[PDB]
Design a protein around this nucleic acid. Structure first.
Ligand SMILES: [Mg+2]
Ligand SMILES: [Zn+2]
Ligand SMILES: [Zn+2]
Ligand SMILES: [Zn+2]
Lengths: 168, 229, 61, 519, 58, 93, 171, 88, 84
RNA sequence: UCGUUGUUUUUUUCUG
């Protein structure tokens, strides 16, 4: 029922192993190709967003929709009740709670700082932004896609992410 | 671009007739009153006489008519046949105008010659067949309505209008409007499966029927027989 | 209605005094074919004379 | 509407891609293996699984639902079944093309007789059309008598002189002229041999020859697994009620199955290279006949009745064939045929419909506020009274037969429902006479119900129909929607056909008594 | 003409038919590109906005 | 509704009438197809609302069509004829 | 990790809904019917972007039915796991064959053979939980696990978490 | 069983002459045993749906093989009317 | 891309007979199955009569999409097409 | 108790 943006893709005689989704080997399927085309065909790059910025966007959009519904007049549950449908309500509340309980950045300013720090393949950079580690050793051990790239600069970025870590 | 059900056999006036007859019928003269427009039929007869701008305009009109006659008589219809299917009756439109406005009697017209010439020429540039500004589009548009425009000029000539028809201003304007509307109504419609129509129109007559002629000849033609009988 | 497929006559109307047999008896309107021509006609249940053990009986079976 | 709901999206076809069927795909789509030639299990119902009547293929009887799809007669489209052939066999239709392909390539190295070095073929490859490119390539390759072993830097060629092959009916003979003069050791090119040859062809030559990697792969032109159409394609005729005869396709498939089993049984015992040859040729023969039964220069397979068999090619071709028999033309519903009669007192576009036809034909009508009362009146009138209706269709498609609904008084229509009212006055109905030479041979009239049993026309409108009242018949096709009524009213109304585009002149006029009277 | 021959040739060449003809759409029971089927009808909302206020969809 | 009648109907250009007169007043039908192989091998169970093209192992890229039953039949011979006419609801060029 | 993508849907409006604000009616119907739907190609449809400026374009009239067919294109953000991706998890319940772990919308199963040996099931501990050396697992406690099996069931994907590798467990 | 009605049939499986008939009227009742109760299937001979008349003469005898052999001859009158055909 | 901007629309402005028939059929179908009526009605019950009455007033909310041979297309609103 | 199904295959003589 839900549509896509890529057409054709008829049967092919020569197959590929690059189908089953994998973050380590970068086989994201035909639906997340290197350089995609949008509805109107404007060249659009693949977009992946960390947990914190995804939470920011979801929260802002949900509250804007709530205001539009309410005509001129914030928490995950009250931001989850805007959705209609028992299953929709449950899923939106659960994902909002996940965003709250794992978003490494919460407020607008901290997210802005980390985003400016971060802003090559978009997946590794976005996953690095989402994935926080104490030292370069752990960042490489948990992320097998950047162990050997001949350009490290993990230590300083990790130290920055640590210094922006809010007290808990 | 004309649909097959919107044409009728009309006679193009300018093709036949001797040079003398054509001159006598279409050519206006202002210097020689013995060959000038009759005064009574026009309220401004005295004004026209001995003019020059009227003379140049009408010489241009006559030149256009002469060019049309030469063009048709040399290029299009060599044999001279002057009866050909074309859209929009003109005789019927003119006589409808006459009846509607009761253009009987010898009432002098109130229709200035420049009005007539300008209106005719403008009409020649409004019979749209293709609506586009490409140089090619304009050239093709001019090519398409060439014969019909020739006919229109052959009919709506100054002498003819002011003597044989004697239209007033309202009648002439209404005639122009009706001509425009009828022509724009007599075009083929996008999507018309003209192929099937041509197929049927050609096949059907054959059903009703020293050289060999008739069905065998048609069969030979269709198959492109290399060695006909 | 178990009273189908039994010869029935007509008492009032344009076909008064003609024999026939019920064909369809959906309700309140009986379609009885006429024996004389090759046609069928409708007629309400009130205008029918039903053949029975004795003579012809009105609609009181 | 009448179709049951489906979750799958509905769309309209846009492109039809042709090509042959890969054996692996054939296996993938088949749901069962057909091995037992006897169709019937034990002559006691429940036909035997693994045989031609496997219920998984699709149910053909009402009370049985397809074991595979689970639907009845309505939706079960028949489900293919495969069948493995012991021996590869030619595909009858592709013999000449296979011959040309074999000519164009080597017998051992299995490549083009020439490389791109030749400028003629260098240009030939550029031709975008596969067919013309293949024609040029064959013209340029059939000349080369020998597949060179060295580049005309070894080309990988076989060096063997490429045989000259001349087709012989169902069999292919290749002629070699071995090294000055030798004995010509021709032999029958076996289908399996050529298949193995083709399996080695690279995609480069494939595309150069006009073929395709995904869809038209040349070795697929040789039959290895024969798909088996469901019972729908070959339904069981009923000669007289209970006794059902086997469609010719059933006999042919069972015979091919028997022959295939028989070949599978020669290898396990004495097979003196002559039983093998004749038996495999017999199998090839049944396969070819089941694929086509009009091969030139060869006798024709027959039933025990002596009548020649009905091969699929025979089915498709001819006027009776599918294309000209049930695809372009087809017997339609909501029609009528009857005798005609002049009637001067009918307006030009009107037409007389006998009352019985009006009562029989029907035009669906949707229920609305503007017609609710009128339609309810029609419904009360019943189907046996005109005006009146025949059916009521619910929003979900449930039909009501007013004949068997004794309780019509207990029905209240709902907006959006559809009523099949009788053919009433002023309705627009098509009207045709066969043959229909030119578009004036069939126009749309306005109905005016009248008694007696003949269509009636205004004497003028005969001219286009080229019809006379001496026993001629014309057909009447009714629309079955609202748009269709719009088109009929606006494009095919008799008044709009007065002037014929053929000769830009009026087509109808005053004829016969009216003319001789006005004079 | 020669239907099976054409079908065989097309299958061999894997010919592609665009279904933009008349006979094709006729076979497939689709609105042919012709006559009333030579265009498409789009429902507009710019003009339907002009409907009075009590015409709003539920 | 012979061929010549089909041609006459084309002449007037009454498309929709011709379409319905050859589908609705005659052998209409519905089918399902796999959007990958473009075949008609989808295994559809409506009451189970489940679909699958086993060859493609596909269960989501499925379309249904309305075509004359005779057309389905012809395609069925053609597959039985070792020829695969694939139907796609999109143009590739 | 989430994806931001451009998504579109097909709508078929009955003509009884023909009025000025049909655009907003379709917008709200899309909002209602889009969320909570999961597919193997995209996954958990959770949120929608630009819920008030959806560009519906121009609707196409279906012949033979008269309904309005709408290609409603839009932009939405949704989530879906991939094998070889590492993200922390939250346990939700405990079972003998593996403690259920609810990683947001989805739930994570753990095999009995992909769990640390020193960690054992102890229902006696109140509330029930698993114990180890300087590691304690309970509902709402940050736990690291790796998911390498993604068998989507069309309606709700099935995920399995393993804590038997290095730098896995609870941070 | 056929959609028509069998009532005009006798107890012996035939219809007597002098009775009226019509379309969809079963004039002969024949039953074929079902190959293995309720083991009988119809083999009737309903009158053509578009014809009407009066049963005139029923002929009953044995065929070449001694099986019961029947024949029914319906008659009716055709009134000239509109649409008929005539020729000098 | 495929659409043509309103300023350079080149096709004939009039309404072809085929467009006329298609529009009438579509409108009548819509009205005849519980759709809004954009114009007043006095005594006419037939949907198709209502359709022509609506057209004569130029009050039809339908946009004709004309496909050029190449594939490009332009769109016209029924409100702006000169009907004979 | 709604429901409710009826052959093919050829050949023939005819109708416009
Ligand atoms: Mg005749
Ligand atoms: Zn089935
Ligand atoms: Zn070789
Ligand atoms: Zn598939």
């Amino acid at each position: 029922v839900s549509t896509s943006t890529v057409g054709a893709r008829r049967r092919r005689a020569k197959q590929q192993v690059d189908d089953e989704e994998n973050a380590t080997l970068l086989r994201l399927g035909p639906e997340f190709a290197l350089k995609q085309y949008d509805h109107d065909g404007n060249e659009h790059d693949l977009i992946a967003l960390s947990l914190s910025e995804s939470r920011l966007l979801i929260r802002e959009a949900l509250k804007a929709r709530s205001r539009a519904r309410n005509g001129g007049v914030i928490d995950d549950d009250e931001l989850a009740k805007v959705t209609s449908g028992a299953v929709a309500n449950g899923v939106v509340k659960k994902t909002l709670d996940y965003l709250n309980t794992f978003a490494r950045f919460k407020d607008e300013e901290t997210c802005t700082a980390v985003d400016q720090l971060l802003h090559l393949h978009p997946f590794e950079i976005a996953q690095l932004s989402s994935l926080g580690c104490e030292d370069v050793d752990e960042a490489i051990t948990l992320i097998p896609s950047l162990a050997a790239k001949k350009e490290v600069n993990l230590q300083r970025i990790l130290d920055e992410l640590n210094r922006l870590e809010d007290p808990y | 671009g004309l649909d097959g059900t919107q044409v009728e056999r009309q006679t193009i006036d300018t093709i036949p007739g001797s040079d003398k007859a054509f001159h006598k019928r279409y050519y206006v003269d202002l210097m020689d009153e013995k060959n000038s427009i009759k005064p009574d039929v026009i309220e401004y007869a005295a004004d026209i006489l001995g003019d020059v701008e009227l003379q140049k305009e009408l010489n241009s009109e006559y030149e256009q008519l002469v060019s049309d006659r030469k063009f048709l008589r040399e290029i299009v219809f060599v044999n001279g046949d002057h009866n050909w299917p074309l859209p929009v009756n003109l005789r019927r439109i003119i006589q409808n105008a006459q009846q509607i406005f009761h253009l009987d009697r010898a009432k002098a017209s109130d229709l200035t010659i420049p009005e007539i010439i300008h209106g005719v020429r403008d009409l020649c540039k409004k019979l749209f067949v293709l609506r586009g500004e490409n140089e090619l589009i304009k050239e093709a548009q001019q090519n398409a309505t060439s014969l019909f425009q020739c006919l229109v000029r052959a009919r709506l000539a100054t002498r003819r209008i002011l003597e044989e028809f004697r239209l007033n201003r309202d009648a002439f304007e209404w005639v122009l409007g009706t001509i425009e509307a009828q022509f724009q109504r007599s075009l083929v419609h996008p999507g018309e499966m003209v192929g099937v129509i041509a197929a049927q129109s050609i096949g059907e007559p054959a059903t009703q029927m020293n050289v060999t002629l008739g069905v065998p000849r048609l069969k030979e033609i269709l198959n492109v027989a290399k060695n006909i009988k | 209605d178990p009273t189908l497929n039994k010869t029935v006559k007509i008492r009032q109307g344009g076909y008064k005094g003609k024999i026939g047999i019920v064909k369809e008896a959906n309700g309140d309107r009986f379609r009885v074919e006429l024996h004389n021509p090759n046609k069928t006609i409708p007629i309400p249940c009130s205008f029918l004379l039903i053949e029975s053990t004795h003579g012809w009986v009105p609609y009181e079976d | 509407s009448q179709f049951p709901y489906s979750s799958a999206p509905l769309r309209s076809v846009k492109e039809v891609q042709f090509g042959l069927l890969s054996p692996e795909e054939i296996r993938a789509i088949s749901v069962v293996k057909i091995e037992y030639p006897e169709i019937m299990d034990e002559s006691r119902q429940r036909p035997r699984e693994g045989g031609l009547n496997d219920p998984k293929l699709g149910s053909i009887d009402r009370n049985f639902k397809c074991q595979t799809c689970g639907e009845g007669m309505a939706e079960c489209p028949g489900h293919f079944g495969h069948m493995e052939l012991a021996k590869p066999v030619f595909h009858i239709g592709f013999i000449p093309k296979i011959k040309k392909v074999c000519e164009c390539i080597c017998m051992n190295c299995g490549k083009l007789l020439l490389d791109e070095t030749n400028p003629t073929m260098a240009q030939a490859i550029r031709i975008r059309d596969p067919k013309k490119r293949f024609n040029a390539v064959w013209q340029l390759c059939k000349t080369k008598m020998v597949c060179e072993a060295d580049a005309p830097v070894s080309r990988g060629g076989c060096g063997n002189t490429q045989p000259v092959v001349r087709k012989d009916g169902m069999k292919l003979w290749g002629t070699w002229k071995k090294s000055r003069d030798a004995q010509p050791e021709r032999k029958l090119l076996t289908p399996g041999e050529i298949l193995n040859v083709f399996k080695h062809i690279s995609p480069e030559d494939c595309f150069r020859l006009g073929f395709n990697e995904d869809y038209a792969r040349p070795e697929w032109m040789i039959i290895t697994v024969l798909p088996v159409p469901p019972p729908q394609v070959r339904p069981s005729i009923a000669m007289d009620e209970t006794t059902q005869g086997q469609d010719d396709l059933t006999h042919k498939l069972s015979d091919i199955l028997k022959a295939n089993i028989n070949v599978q049984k020669l290898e396990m015992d004495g097979s003196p290279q002559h039983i093998i040859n004749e038996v495999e040729q017999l199998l090839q023969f049944h396969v070819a006949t089941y694929m086509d039964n009009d091969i030139a220069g060869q006798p024709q397979a027959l039933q025990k009745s002596g009548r020649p068999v009905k091969a699929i090619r025979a089915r498709l071709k001819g006027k009776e064939g599918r294309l000209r028999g049930n695809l372009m033309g087809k017997r339609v519903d909501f029609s009528a045929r009857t005798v005609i009669s002049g009637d001067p007192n009918l307006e030009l576009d009107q037409v007389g419909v006998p009352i019985s036809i009006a009562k029989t034909l029907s035009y669906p009508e949707t229920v609305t506020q503007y017609n609710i009362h009128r339609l309810t009146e029609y419904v009360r009138n019943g189907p046996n009274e005109h005006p009146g209706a025949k059916y009521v269709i619910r929003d979900n498609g449930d039909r009501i037969d007013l004949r068997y609904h004794k309780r019509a008084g207990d029905i209240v229509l709902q907006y959006g429902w559809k009523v099949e009212r009788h053919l009433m006055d002023d309705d627009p109905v098509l009207f045709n006479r066969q043959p229909s030479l030119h578009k004036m041979s069939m126009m749309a009239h306005r109905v005016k119900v009248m008694p007696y049993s003949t269509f009636r026309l205004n004497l003028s409108v005969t001219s286009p129909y080229n019809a006379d009242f001496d026993g001629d018949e014309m057909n009447l096709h009714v629309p079955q929607s609202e748009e269709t009524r719009a088109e009929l009213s606006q494009l095919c109304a008799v008044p709009l056909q007065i002037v014929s585009p053929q000769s830009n002149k009026p087509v109808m006029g005053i004829v016969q008594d009216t003319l001789c009277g006005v004079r | 003409e020669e239907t099976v021959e054409i079908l065989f040739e097309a299958g061999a060449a894997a010919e592609l038919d665009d279904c933009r003809g008349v006979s094709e759409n006729v076979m497939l029971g689709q609105l042919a590109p012709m006559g009333t089927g030579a265009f498409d009808v789009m429902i507009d909302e710019k003009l339907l906005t002009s409907l009075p206020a009590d015409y709003a969809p539920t | 509704f012979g061929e010549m009648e089909r041609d006459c109907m084309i002449a007037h250009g009454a498309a929709g009438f011709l379409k319905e007169r050859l589908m609705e007043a005659s052998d209409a039908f519905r089918v399902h197809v796999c959007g990958i192989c473009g075949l008609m091998s989808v295994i559809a169970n409506l009451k189970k609302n489940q679909f699958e093209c086993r060859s493609c192992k596909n269960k989501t890229n499925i379309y249904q069509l309305h075509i004359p039953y005779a057309a389905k039949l012809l395609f069925q011979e053609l597959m039985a004829m070792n020829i695969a006419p694939r139907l796609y609801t999109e143009r590739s060029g | 990790m989430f994806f931001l993508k451009d998504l579109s849907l097909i709508l078929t409006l009955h003509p009884s809904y023909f009025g000025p604000q049909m655009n907003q009616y379709l917008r709200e119907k899309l909002l209602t019917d889009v969320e909570g739907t999961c597919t193997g190609q995209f996954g958990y449809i959770v949120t929608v972007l630009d819920g008030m400026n959806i560009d519906v374009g121009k609707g196409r009239i279906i012949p033979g039915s008269g309904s309005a067919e709408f290609e409603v294109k839009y932009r939405a953000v949704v989530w879906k796991p991939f094998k070889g991706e590492v993200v922390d998890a939250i346990v939700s319940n405990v079972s003998p064959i593996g403690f259920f772990a609810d990683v947001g919308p989805l739930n994570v199963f753990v095999s009995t053979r992909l769990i640390p040996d020193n960690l054992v099931y102890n229902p006696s501990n109140s509330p029930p939980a698993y114990m180890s050396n300087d590691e304690l697992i309970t509902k709402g406690s940050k736990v690291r696990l790796k998911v390498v099996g993604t068998r989507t069931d069309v309606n709700e994907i099935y995920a399995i978490g393993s804590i038997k590798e290095d730098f896995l467990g609870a941070i | 069983l056929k959609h028509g009605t069998y009532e005009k049939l006798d107890e012996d499986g035939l219809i007597a002459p002098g009775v009226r008939v019509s379309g969809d009227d079963i004039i002969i009742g024949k039953t074929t045993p079902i190959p293995p109760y309720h083991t009988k299937r119809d083999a009737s001979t309903p009158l053509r749906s578009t014809e009407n008349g009066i049963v005139d003469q029923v002929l009953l005898t044995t065929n070449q093989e001694g099986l019961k052999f029947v024949k029914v001859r319906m008659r009716t009158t055709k009134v000239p009317q509109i649409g008929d055909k005539f020729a000098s | 891309e495929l659409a043509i901007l309103k300023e350079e629309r080149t096709t004939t402005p009039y309404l072809t007979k085929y467009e006329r028939a298609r529009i009438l059929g579509t409108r009548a179908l819509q009205i005849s199955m519980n759709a809004p009526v954009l114009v007043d009605i006095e005594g006419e019950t037939d949907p198709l009569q209502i359709a022509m009455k609506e057209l004569s007033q130029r009050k039809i909310p339908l946009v004709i999409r004309r496909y050029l041979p190449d594939g490009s297309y332009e769109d016209w609103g029924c409100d702006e097409l000169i009907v004979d």
